[PDB]
Amino acid sequence: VREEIESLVQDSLMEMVKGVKNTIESDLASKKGLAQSTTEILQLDPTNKAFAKSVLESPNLKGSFLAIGLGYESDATVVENDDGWEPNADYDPRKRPWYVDAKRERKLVVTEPYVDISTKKIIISIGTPVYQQSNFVGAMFYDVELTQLAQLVNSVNLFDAGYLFITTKDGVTIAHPNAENNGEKFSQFLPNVDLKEGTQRIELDGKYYLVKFAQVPSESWYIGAVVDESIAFAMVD
Amino acid sequence: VREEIESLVQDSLMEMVKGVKNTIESDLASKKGLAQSTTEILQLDPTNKAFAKSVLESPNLKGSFLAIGLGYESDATVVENDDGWEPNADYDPRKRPWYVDAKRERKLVVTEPYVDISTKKIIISIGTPVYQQSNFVGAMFYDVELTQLAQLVNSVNLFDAGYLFITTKDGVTIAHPNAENNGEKFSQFLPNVDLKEGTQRIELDGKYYLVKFAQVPSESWYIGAVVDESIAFAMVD
Ligand code: PRO
Ligand code: PRO
Ligand SMILES: [Ca+2]
Ligand SMILES: [Ca+2]
């Protein structure tokens, strides 16, 4: 009997996570498409900054990212659509992670989590390189608000038994219902758990918890789901 | 015993279809985002046709749709990125369904299936209106190749027992492993089945088949899955 309910919880837990992994991969691919196309369109006239300014204020694009901008290699200037942020003499775009990563990889990248100079929160960014006839001209950032990412992974009913979260391949937390955890290794809130695909079962504070991880292939992110085993058992009802 | 295997086939069938519905809604939302942003960017200078031409040839955008173009209200001209098609004196963009629909609705639309003048296949299109300071200036099409749509819905292992397909809310087939069915009511290949969500069980040619439909809310499309019941039973193994 216990194994009857156990293998149905396990398998319903399988459902929700693979369902979430696909949803995250889709939204990620979608944001990457929007970023790639925006970059290519800016490359029609990459040093026409007035052009780039207008494009970044177009409403659908502007509303799809926390913030978008383009830093220039030659003059270290920034064209940017953040309504509550401007650079000053302490800011050089070329020293930033989205920029350095896009310059290094010479293609679209997704950064590690880092502190946003604007919101002062941990974020991630899509970074893209900008070319003028195969000369590197600068790079773009498309910032991703991580609490919105946490709402996205927690778009499934997890029996009301727990929650989902995301980590990098090194276990650095990317999304969590409590954003304070972003930027921390996940062992901070979920100790004695190894970062590996499959299911683990551990006790914490006198209760058992099921933990499921599923990899996101394209960025080697992990989707974590944690559920109170007892509440899970109940909430198949 | 039969009801034991039956309720697991039913529920695995539940999994795959809701999994597919979400995947279709995601890709649709993604294409709509790309189309909305492209239209808005063209609206920065809507009668600069040279500008629109360049944008539509940018590779990521061009590779995301079968074909993209913009027809103009004033002169009935077409800017268009189809490498194997040009209009002639028998073609007027303003009489086409993507155009008429976008003009009618005054927002982004997804057309009913219709015959593509270029490929001579049934397709669908995202249509968008183009404005110059709230005067209607023309409309855009973003064509969707339906066999690629059929590959997308059939991205799940359906036990090797059958296949998935898509219909409009009127049961007109939008995607099918055999594209010959596109544009036909689904009763052509799947008779005595009502178009409704849930599961039906019918006999055809001396075998029982399970049929699951799930609605796609945003366009009122239906995702159909058909499986040979016996093969389904086997292929949980
Ligand atoms: O932190 C950075 O470098 C970018 C630019 C402002 C918003 N995020
Ligand atoms: O059939 C039409 O009107 C559009 C334009 C060429 C491709 N599809
Ligand atoms: Ca600003
Ligand atoms: Ca052409």
For the Cβ of A69 lying below 6 angstroms from any atom of ligand 1, the answer is yes
Q: How far apart are CA B206 and CA B200, in angstroms?
A: 16
The first and second tokens of residue B11, run together, are 């529920």
* Kind plus residue range of the DSSP H or E element containing A110: strand A109-110
Smallest Cβ–Cβ distance between A37 and the set B15, B43, B60 belongs to B60
> Ligand 2 centre from B76 Cα, in Å?
13
What are the sequence ranges of the domains in chain A?
1-33+146-237, 34-145
Residue type present at position B160? D
What's the resolution in A?
A: 2.3
The first and second tokens of residue A146, run together, are 């991580």
A87–chain B Cβ distance below 8 A for any pair: no
Q: How far apart are CA B44 and CA A61, in angstroms?
A: 13
Spatial neighbors of A120 by CB under 8 A, at least 6 apart, are none
Torsion (CA) A8, A14, A15, A16 in degrees, nearest 10? 110
> What is the least distance, in Å, from the CA of A41 to any CA of chain B?
6
Smallest Cβ–Cβ distance between B55 and the set A19, A41, A58 belongs to A41
Spatial neighbors of A133 by CB under 8 A, at least 6 apart, are none
Distance separating the N- and C-terminal Cα atoms of chain B: 14
Under a CB-based contact definition with an 8 Å cutoff, are residues B42 and B51 in contact? Answer: yes
The first and second tokens of residue A79, run together, are 């064209």
Number of neighbouring beta carbons within 10 Å of residue A190: 22
Q: How far apart are CA B148 and CA B144, in angstroms?
A: 8
Please report the atom of ligand 1 found closest to the CA of residue A119. 7
A41–chain B Cβ distance below 8 A for any pair: yes
Q: How far apart are CA A91 and CA A99, in angstroms?
A: 13
Q: How far apart are CA B155 and CA A163, in angstroms?
A: 28
Query: How many alpha carbons fall within 13 Å on the CB side of residue A85?
Result: 16
Q: How far apart are CA A217 and CA A236, in angstroms?
A: 30
CA of A84, nearest ligand number: 3
DSSP category for residue B86: -
Interface probe for B, chosen from A58, A128, A152 (most Cβ of B below 10 Å), is A58
Q: Which CATH architecture has domain B34-145?
A: 2-Layer Sandwich (3.30)
| Owner of token pair 């268009």 | B80
A60–chain B Cβ distance below 8 A for any pair: yes
CA of A127, nearest ligand number: 1
Spatial neighbors of A75 by CB under 8 A, at least 6 apart, are none
The first and second tokens of residue A171, run together, are 């276990």
A55–chain B Cβ distance below 8 A for any pair: yes
Map residue B15 onto helix, strand or coil.
helix
Q: Whose CA is nearest to atom 8 of ligand 1?
A: A116
Spatial neighbors of B15 by CB under 8 A, at least 6 apart, are A15
Under a CB-based contact definition with an 8 Å cutoff, are residues B169 and B221 in contact? Answer: yes
Map residue B114 onto helix, strand or coil.
strand
B64–chain A Cβ distance below 8 A for any pair: yes
Give residues preceding each break in chain B, C–N over 2.5 A: none
Contact residues of ligand 2, CB 6 A cut-off: B 67, 69, 82, 85, 96, 116-118, 141, 143
- In degrees and rounded to multiples of 5, residue B175 shows phi and psi of -155, 135
Contacts 24+ apart (CB under 8 A), A78-86: A79/A49, A79/A52, A79/A53, A80/A56, A81/A53, A81/A56, A81/A57, A82/A118, A84/A118, A85/A117, A85/A118
According to DSSP, the β-strands at A162-167 and A173-175 are antiparallel
Interface probe for B, chosen from A13, A16, A25, A30 (most Cβ of B below 10 Å), is A30
Q: How far apart are CA A156 and CA B34, in angstroms?
A: 26
List C-alpha distances in Å: B203 to B17, B166, B210, B230: 21, 21, 9, 12
| Owner of token pair 């196309």 | A37
Residue type present at position A146? L
- Measured at the CA of B66, the angle between CA B65 and CA B72, to 5 degrees, comes to 85
> Ligand 3 centre from A141 Cα, in Å?
14
Assign residue B27 a region: left if phi > 0, alpha if psi is -120 to 50, beta otherwise?
alpha
Please report the atom of ligand 1 found closest to the CA of residue A78. 5
Is A34-145 in the same CATH topology as A1-33+146-237? yes
Query: How many alpha carbons fall within 13 Å on the CB side of residue A11?
Result: 10
**Residue of chain B nearest A14, judged by CA positions:** B15
Q: How far apart are CA B183 and CA A21, in angstroms?
A: 33
| Owner of token pair 């997804």 | B110
Residue B186 class from Cβ within 10 Å (0-12 exposed, 13-18 middle, 19+ buried)? buried
List C-alpha distances in Å: A193 to A173, A185, A209: 14, 11, 11
Distance separating the N- and C-terminal Cα atoms of chain A: 14
CATH number at B1-33+146-237: 3.30.450.20
Q: How far apart are CA B20 and CA B149, in angstroms?
A: 12
